[PDB]
């Protein structure tokens, strides 16, 4: 149908259907008459997961032949989605498959929407390491993706009495056909025991074994014939586990409960022993995997020339001692020379200031399940305290700041400081977080080691965050400036030249428009809520959290319906406000929120006079799949974090890739988006960072601004009277007493700047040329956006390797 | 290379070599130079899967045509061993594949010594079960094994100085290929609760549901392309399940529990409420999937002319009560006209006459997990005692002798009482076990029902245990009689005609000379352990239990060591004593058997005196794959339970049709094989039934034959004393005191007759010649035990179904 979905040859389509037909016989045990639309999908997912074998085998003898530097991104979290429809993009079988289904009399669309996502994250820090194993692979690195199986994912949200109530995601109930099982790569894990120090060294003895073995899932390149390796750790017991019988049997449970589920909390460390369990789980099972590939290329000198280890926040923060550890005890290096290999080995990369989400251990915990790690850590601390004492003599504060170990009523172990020690390279995501964490949090590590200090802007993949998710734009696009941009992204700048283009305005308006009427229909058939395609679709899709402030939009929201209840007959510019995201389970004042959120969709979308002219929809279970959906039916994207909180936000770049305009505070990746496309071209408004801090030196008075905004004080007395919950009329005093009273990040401080751009944002729409015109400048400059940008930087400035747009052999 | 393993036609090695391969590549994700010997059996495994396919969906398509009447065989235990050689035999492609392998360099017999056994059984009752299915599909029966997909088959036994240790049976850790998931097919299953009585009769409410997943096996018939399903439930959490957050995730494990472990334990009821739920579990689950496909062919009346249900033991006796309760409860029919169809729907197997073994479940047990099933028990009950009364006005006693209840300290149901009400057939299996229930156990129930109860003589399938496990000696036969014996074992009777035969002696000679040969050479390479191939074999091989008096035998082993002490110079006939069997965890007594053995094999072993005269081994882990090497090799089968004890016994077949004589009393099968055989053909000695009952009149004394036999007296001393535990001293004294005072087995009672007898076998094995011309008449008279034979009828005079051996088209 459309050019950038590749060719439908006659032979290829002749020999999808025939493999087709056979995987729904031999594979499935099915036939045509009593098959459903699921055996469909999984006789589809067979045949194409068929065309990834030959190149997965060849990419993998291919590095063991030219043995380049191996690099291993190690995360606790790997948030996939659906796999079907990206392989085919990779492998340029989008179209072939789509007619060789139709011929069958297949919907393919349908049978897409019946596999399930692999949620293995809870958000941004997730997406980013899948985005990431998709650059790596089309930028042809050697590049290894390691994590946990986990059993269960993020949990399924389902909104009741308009609460969140959480379900678990039972993800591999059907099965998943993209995975490898390698049960025969199965290394054991050791936990607890105790040091024993003899005459040649400390020996850690008396241990407990949980074994690891790994499930292997192909990450294809996009047609470079690259395929590289995603590799998941499931817990498994050894067969002699607690061996009254039948007891000891079932009691297997407690090892496999490593890798469960997915830990949910995105907003607030907890010091969860099963959580310490995981994250040592994956450390010690890929260090071992990592070790021995090295070996089978005595001399670990060129162990940094080979190997690199990116750790996605601190959470595989075990790495640095556990190589120690193998380094000094088992290979029985000296303790210089394993630190000198352990610190050009590995790189950290942080995602958040916020001193709430930062891991701080236990020293008690680390001493009962890691014995010998924690005797590491302590002369790890100490030496580079002694190298600490060296550069700042005198300096008694810096020492306690910055110690590893934090002394109080439990001492506790800061990874963060761990990681940094052991790091050659320390980044964060976005220029200003970069800058952030150098002039405050790591501020003393700065002054001692500026040179490990670096910038990484995020990115996202345009494969699925484009040509995937919207083939209409990048149709269109394709059609002016050919096919090379969705590898070289910066391509899109060509686009500049057609912002006075009268066709291009059209098609770009025209894309815009498909794309709403099929997500309005979505809504519909789904859920069976009713939308006006024609307003302007006003979107919020992100976690729920207090930093990102959904809060603000809930008040411009009531804001609107207020206006619109004191001059009913005056017009306004139609919304859509669409607000979406997922809790923390123990996260009280989130789940507040979203209960908030329906609160007010319920008043305002039964109002006879408001009409169609406002609409509040919470959308349910907001994931990879269907920020898919949403993200291209966007015209607005709210990106409204309070100046220095949210680190980068990946969300607004895929919102701006897909032709939404942006109302954003200057916070994160914002700002080189409006660096980008020009300040003009973006809705900003509010404090600035330095605002923020002016503020906190004065003393945030949230009263002031009470007293001072009548607007303000109207839905604050609605708020606390119950106006928006008459039969429960102070449920939402929590709420309200945190924003009047003890609220971090400033609601208050930003509404009056916040509803004025917002009635800039009306006024635009109401020009739908120049709307799509300033949307066309968006588009154009979203290019250094690209994570294929963001990975082929950490190749050049961290790891050591050229990435190459060269092809296989197929 | 021999005629009964097929056809290796040049257009199938063809084929089967190149799916061979596209396996290995596509589905096992390999090439030739990292493939280890276990990745090539699954490409084989799955090579000939494929095979199965075709004939698989025709055969339940044939069903759905015809909708002849439906035979579903509920069993707690299906004892499958290895399903790769078995599914080449009955399909034809042994010898084609065997080519295949060898062409591209394999070795196909080391390769099926890589797959697991699905060990879902203790050994007879489960391995009958698993025959039983073998014969339903070869005679053409539309029959369902029903069943637990256990997770932890029977364990597997590590032998550590001289003691049994268990360790778990992972049979699943490297996958199934021979399994179907059907997630689709899910269905629920019901706990816990409460009854409510309402206007329109009882509800079961407030109940807490667990899922039950199906995975389906191929069963193959032998060569008339007929393909029947075995169903495994699988028990799986609902996903709203405990739904702080991550607790109740890993809750989930509590439900799925259900399926965990097989329960080891076949010498005693434990009445434990894990066992309980595994119980209700496969009933609830298979009787939903019998009712749902009945109505996909309203009125019931019909439902006994298109179902029969086989109970296989009491195991699954909840059947009974549970189709009651969905017919009343759930269908809304009259009382009477339920139980009408219940009756003439079930039947009943009883496998033991042993009190300790007969399930009696608690009341509180069944009160608080499935309440309504215990008031529908208690109406059955009452009517049923109703019936009595009328038929035997005024004896009180035969009232509470026949009651499902138990009054006591704890009340019970006993479960064997509600099987026999409640079904239209009773069998015992074999004679006199059938004739001992009517006599003893159920002679209440026989007064009142006689025309209930049957037997039906247990037999074996041909197909594993002579084609499979010793196609030498199926190849002589079929060189002199063809191949129709392979499904017709009746033809059998054509070898008598050759017992005169000089070519036929020698083949049949030769045949066990080359199995004997080949399994002192297993020993060796698998546990380093030295025999003489030249010596009597001597094997006992089944699982530990005091009624099946492998004391007995230990006794015997130590008779002759004493007299080869005495008397050194003297000729004795060499033997090596084999036994072997798994003990029940919890039973103490088998577990010090075990230890017994070991000791005597300790002292024995290491005698310079003795040599290569004897020789005591126990053999390690039996199962059916070790069966199928040893039986071969045997040329005494001990079959020596007292009699009464062994209902029937397999193993004891098992032997017969291998070229084994026997040594054994008149119990079980072993009457109905002599009488075969001829008494003149068999080593019968020891007290019948009636001398046993004799005894009990009078009273046991062991003591008796104590003083009476010098022989016994020496070796009850050297056990006291300490001579096969020299460390230990008094290590058997929980023998010797069982022996001397609590000896419910009499094993001092046919030790005389039995030491006699033995040494009649070894007068006839200086004799090869007449050794085995008695071997060729046991052979020839083995027919009547098929389990061809039992099927039959099974079908003709219990479910009232007509066996055929037509073929279906390939
Ligand atoms: O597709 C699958 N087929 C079989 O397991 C199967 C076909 C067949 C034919 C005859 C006899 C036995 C047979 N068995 N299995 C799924 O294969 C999926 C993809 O690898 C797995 O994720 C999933 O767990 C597994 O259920
Ligand atoms: O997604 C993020 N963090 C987590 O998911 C997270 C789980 C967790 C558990 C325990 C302790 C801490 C934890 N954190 N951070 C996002 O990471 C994204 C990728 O860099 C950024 O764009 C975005 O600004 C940032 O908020
Ligand atoms: O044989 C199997 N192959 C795969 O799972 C597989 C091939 C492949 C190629 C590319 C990408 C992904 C891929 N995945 N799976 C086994 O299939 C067996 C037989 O059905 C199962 O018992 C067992 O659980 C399962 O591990
Ligand atoms: O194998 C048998 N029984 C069991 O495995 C068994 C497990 C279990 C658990 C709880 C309560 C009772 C239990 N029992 N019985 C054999 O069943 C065989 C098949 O009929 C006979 O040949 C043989 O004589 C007989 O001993
Ligand atoms: C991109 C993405 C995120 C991250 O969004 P932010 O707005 O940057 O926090 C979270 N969840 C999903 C499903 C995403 O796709
Ligand atoms: C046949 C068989 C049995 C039954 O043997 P008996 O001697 O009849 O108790 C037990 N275990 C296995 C593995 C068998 O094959």
Chains 1, 2 share one sequence.
């Not at 923390?584 to 789940?591: C, L, N, V, W």
């Not at 900003?684 to 960072?689: D, H, K, L, Q």
């Not at 106006?723 to 429960?728: D, G, L």
């Amino acid at each position: 149908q459309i050019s950038v979905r590749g060719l439908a040859g006659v032979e290829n389509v002749t020999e999808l259907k025939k493999n087709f037909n056979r995987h729904l016989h031999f594979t499935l045990v099915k036939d045509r008459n009593v098959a459903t639309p699921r055996d469909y999908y999984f006789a589809l997912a067979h045949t194409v997961r068929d065309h990834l074998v030959g190149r997965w085998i060849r990419t993998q003898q291919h590095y063991y032949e030219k043995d380049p530097k191996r690099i291993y991104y190690l995360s606790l979290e790997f948030y996939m989605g659906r796999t079907l429809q990206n392989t085919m993009v990779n492998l340029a079988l989008e179209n072939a498959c789509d007619e060789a289904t139709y011929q069958l009399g297949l919907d393919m669309e349908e049978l897409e929407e019946i596999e399930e996502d692999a949620g293995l994250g809870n958000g941004g820090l997730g997406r980013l390491a899948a985005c990431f194993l998709d650059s790596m692979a089309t930028l042809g690195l050697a590049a290894y993706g390691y994590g946990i199986r986990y059993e269960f994912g993020i949990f399924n949200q389902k909104i009741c009495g308009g609460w969140q109530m959480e379900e678990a995601d039972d993800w591999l109930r059907y099965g998943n056909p993209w995975e490898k099982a390698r049960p025969e790569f199965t290394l054991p894990v050791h936990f607890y025991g105790r040091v024993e120090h003899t005459s040649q060294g400390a020996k850690w003895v008396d241990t407990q074994v949980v074994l690891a073995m790994p499930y292997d899932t192909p990450v294809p390149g996009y047609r470079n014939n690259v395929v590289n390796t995603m590799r998941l750790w499931s817990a498994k017991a050894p067969n002699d586990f607690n061996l009254g019988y039948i007891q000891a049997v079932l009691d297997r449970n407690l090892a496999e409960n490593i890798s469960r589920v997915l830990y949910p909390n995105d907003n607030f460390f907890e010091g969860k022993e099963l959580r310490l369990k995981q994250e040592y789980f994956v450390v010690a099972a890929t260090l071992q995997d990592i070790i021995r590939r090295f070996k089978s290329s005595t001399n670990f000198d060129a162990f940094p020339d080979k190997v690199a280890i990116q750790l996605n926040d601190t959470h595989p923060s075990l790495a640095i001692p556990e190589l120690m550890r193998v380094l000094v005890d088992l290979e029985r290096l000296d303790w210089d020379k394993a630190w000198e290999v352990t610190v050009k080995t590995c790189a950290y990369t942080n995602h958040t200031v916020l001193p709430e989400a930062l891991e701080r251990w236990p020293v008690h915990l680390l001493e009962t399940l890691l014995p010998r790690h924690l005797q590491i850590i302590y002369e790890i601390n100490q030496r580079f305290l002694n190298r600490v004492a060296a550069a700042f003599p005198g300096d008694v504060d810096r020492l306690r700041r910055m110690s590893l170990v934090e002394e109080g009523a439990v001492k506790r172990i800061n990874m963060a400081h761990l990681c940094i020690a052991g790091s050659h390279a320390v980044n964060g995501v976005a220029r200003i977080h970069s800058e952030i964490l150098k002039k405050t949090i790591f501020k003393d590590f700065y002054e001692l080691e500026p040179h490990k200090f670096q910038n990484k802007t995020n990115g996202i993949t345009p494969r699925r965050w484009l040509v995937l998710c919207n083939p209409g734009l990048a149709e269109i696009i394709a059609e002016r400036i050919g096919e090379e941009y969705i590898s070289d992204l910066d391509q899109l700048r060509k686009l500049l030249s057609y912002v006075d283009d009268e066709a291009f305005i059209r098609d770009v308006a025209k894309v815009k428009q498909e794309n709403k009427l099929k997500f309005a229909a979505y809504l519909e058939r789904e859920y069976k809520v009713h939308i006006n395609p024609n307003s302007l679709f006003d979107v919020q899709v992100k976690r729920i959290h207090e930093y990102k402030r959904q809060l603000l939009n809930c008040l411009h929201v009531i804001t609107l319906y207020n206006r619109i209840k004191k001059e009913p007959n005056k017009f306004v510019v139609p919304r859509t406000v669409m607000i979406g995201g997922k809790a923390a389970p123990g996260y009280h004042m989130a789940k507040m929120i979203i209960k908030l959120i329906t609160a007010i969709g319920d008043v305002v979308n039964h109002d006879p006079v408001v009409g169609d002219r406002l609409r509040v929809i919470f959308l349910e279970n907001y994931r990879v799949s269907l920020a898919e959906k949403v993200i291209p039916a966007a015209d607005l994207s709210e990106q409204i974090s309070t100046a220095g909180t949210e680190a980068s936000g990946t969300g607004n770049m895929k919102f701006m890739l897909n032709g939404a305009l942006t109302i954003g505070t200057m916070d994160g990746a914002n700002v080189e988006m409006a660096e980008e496309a020009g300040e003009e071209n973006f809705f900003i408004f509010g404090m600035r960072v330095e605002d923020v801090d002016r503020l906190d030196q004065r003393g945030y008075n949230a009263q002031e601004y009470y007293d001072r905004i009548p607007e303000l004080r109207q839905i604050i007395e609605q708020l606390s009277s119950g106006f928006f919950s008459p039969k429960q009329p102070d449920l939402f005093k929590d709420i309200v007493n945190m924003l009047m009273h003890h609220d971090r990040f400033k609601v208050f401080a930003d509404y009056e700047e916040y509803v004025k751009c917002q009635e800039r944002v009306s006024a635009l729409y109401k020009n739908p040329r120049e709307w799509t015109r300033m949307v066309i400048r968006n588009i154009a400059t979203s290019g250094k956006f690209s994570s294929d940008r963001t990975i082929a930087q950490y190749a050049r400035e961290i790891w050591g390797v050229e990435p190459s747009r060269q092809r296989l052999p197929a």
